[PDB]
Amino acid sequence: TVFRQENVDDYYDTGEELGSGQFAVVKKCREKSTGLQYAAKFIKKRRTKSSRRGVSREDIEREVSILKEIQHPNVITLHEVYENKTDVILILELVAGGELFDFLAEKESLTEEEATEFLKQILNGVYYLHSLQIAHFDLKPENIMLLDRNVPKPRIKIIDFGLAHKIDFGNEFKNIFGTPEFVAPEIVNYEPLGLEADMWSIGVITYILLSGASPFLGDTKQETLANVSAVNYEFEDEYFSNTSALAKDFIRRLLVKDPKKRMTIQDSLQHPWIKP
Numbered sequence: 001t002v003f004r005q006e007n008v009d010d011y012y013d014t015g016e017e018l019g020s021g022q023f024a025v026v027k028k029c030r031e032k033s034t035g036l037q038y039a040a041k042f043i044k045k046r047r048t049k050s051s052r053r054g055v056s057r058e059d060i061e062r063e064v065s066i067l068k069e070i071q072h073p074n075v076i077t078l079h080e081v082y083e084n085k086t087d088v089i090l091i092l093e094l095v096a097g098g099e100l101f102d103f104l105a106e107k108e109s110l111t112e113e114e115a116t117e118f119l120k121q122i123l124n125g126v127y128y129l130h131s132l133q134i135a136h137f138d139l140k141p142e143n144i145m146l147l148d149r150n151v152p153k154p155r156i157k158i159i160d161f162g163l164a165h166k167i168d169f170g171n172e173f174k175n176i177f178g179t180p181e182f183v184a185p186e187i188v189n190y191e192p193l194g195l196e197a198d199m200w201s202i203g204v205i206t207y208i209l210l211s212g213a214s215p216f217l218g219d220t221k222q223e224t225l226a227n228v229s230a231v232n233y234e235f236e237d238e239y240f241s242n243t244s245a246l247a248k249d250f251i252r253r254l255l256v257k258d259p260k261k262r263m264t265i266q267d268s269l270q271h272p273w274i275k276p
């Protein structure tokens, strides 16, 4: 598929950076014709067929295809796509309240009500994606953004569909692998992946939300991955002594090695800690 090749600077003015990654830079922008603001994600393209730098056209097209399909309050929306010889430029909905990651660092850890307030929205967003047979594969606090960080109950949106894939056959067997602290054992072991990987990630996020601590984090990436594969985590009393047994139950049913035995998104929404 080809995208709009007009100079993006002809239709938009850019401003402050809102994110810098390995192969992408995100800048706030304003459309000249409407005055509306967006986030422009500039993704560097591969310069040669077998280059290691940049994102393959195949990967960019998949991301765009998934983004064009989604419309839900808890997921980011794609406005337009531009491209030139060096980059693909995604004009995305602006989410200006910062990362759930930064908010978490500002509070240390959340109460169960605050954690379930965020978690319910994450679950709703993932329920939408899974309903569409879309696995995100990169769920973590950095990829959760608040619309407004200064309200008592912030609204959140899931971002960064860079690793997302359609799962038409129940599983996918490809070069997929995100951040060690949040990836499921099946990712670590290079096994077929499905929607269940996202449910493990949610378990990790939930543990972090309640404690301020990462459950499998080691001193090196390889140690983290090893901990994940062995399901080497525990609820430290120092952090969980006043956490409800039901909250721990929820986490325990997500941090299960066998994907077939892990709670599904539907089960998570019916779990007693979540179900109102």
Ligand SMILES: CN(C)c1cc(-c2ccncc2)c(Cl)nn1
Pocket: 018, 019, 020, 021, 026, 039, 041, 092, 093, 094, 095, 096, 099, 142, 143, 145, 159, 160
């Ligand atoms: C923080 N990281 C990794 C981000 C943030 C954004 C973003 C920022 C603001 N509004 C919408 C999206 C995107 Cl597109 N990609 N990565």
